[PDB]
Amino acid sequence: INANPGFWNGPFRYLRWSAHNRPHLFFAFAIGIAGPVAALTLTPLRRKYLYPDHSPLPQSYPLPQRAREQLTGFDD
């Protein structure tokens, strides 16, 4: 009855066949591939329009990049 029509013979017909006759594999692949493509295509749109990326959090003490300025106060 229904049988694999070959992906290379016709792409959209094969996709329709897969979606009707191997829904588990078809939708597993669809969900899996939607991820990275959406990342690449949509992340810059989000940055441009919704909100920019956050400011980094500190990981260690932020050391000043300068020389000791001696100091005066709270001494002996």
Ligand X SMILES: CCCCCCCCCCCCCCCCCC(=O)OC[C@H](COP(=O)(O)OCCN)OC(=O)CCCCCCCCCCCCCCCCC
Ligand Y SMILES: CCCCCCCCCCCCCCCCCC(=O)OC[C@H](COP(=O)([O-])OCC(O)COP(=O)([O-])OC[C@@H](COC(=O)CCCCCCCCCCCCCCCCC)OC(=O)CCCCCCCCCCCCCCCCC)OC(=O)CCCCCCCCCCCCCCCCC
Please write down the HEC assignment for all residues of 2-53.
CCCCCCCCCHHHHHHHHHHHCHHHHHHHHHHHHHHHHHHHHHHHHHHHHCCC
* Binding-site string for ligand Y from residue 34 to residue 73, where x marks contact by CB under 6 A and - marks none: --x--xx---x-----------------------------
In this structure, the dihedral spanned by the alpha carbons of residues 26, 4, 14 and 10, taken in order and rounded to 10 degrees, is 160
Q: Please, which of residues 37-76 interact with another protein by CB under 8 A?
A: 38-39, 42-43, 46, 50-64, 66-71, 73-76
Residue 42 binds to ligand X (criterion: CB under 6 A):
no
Q: Which residues bind ligand Y (CB under 6 A)?
A: 4, 6-8, 36, 39-40, 44
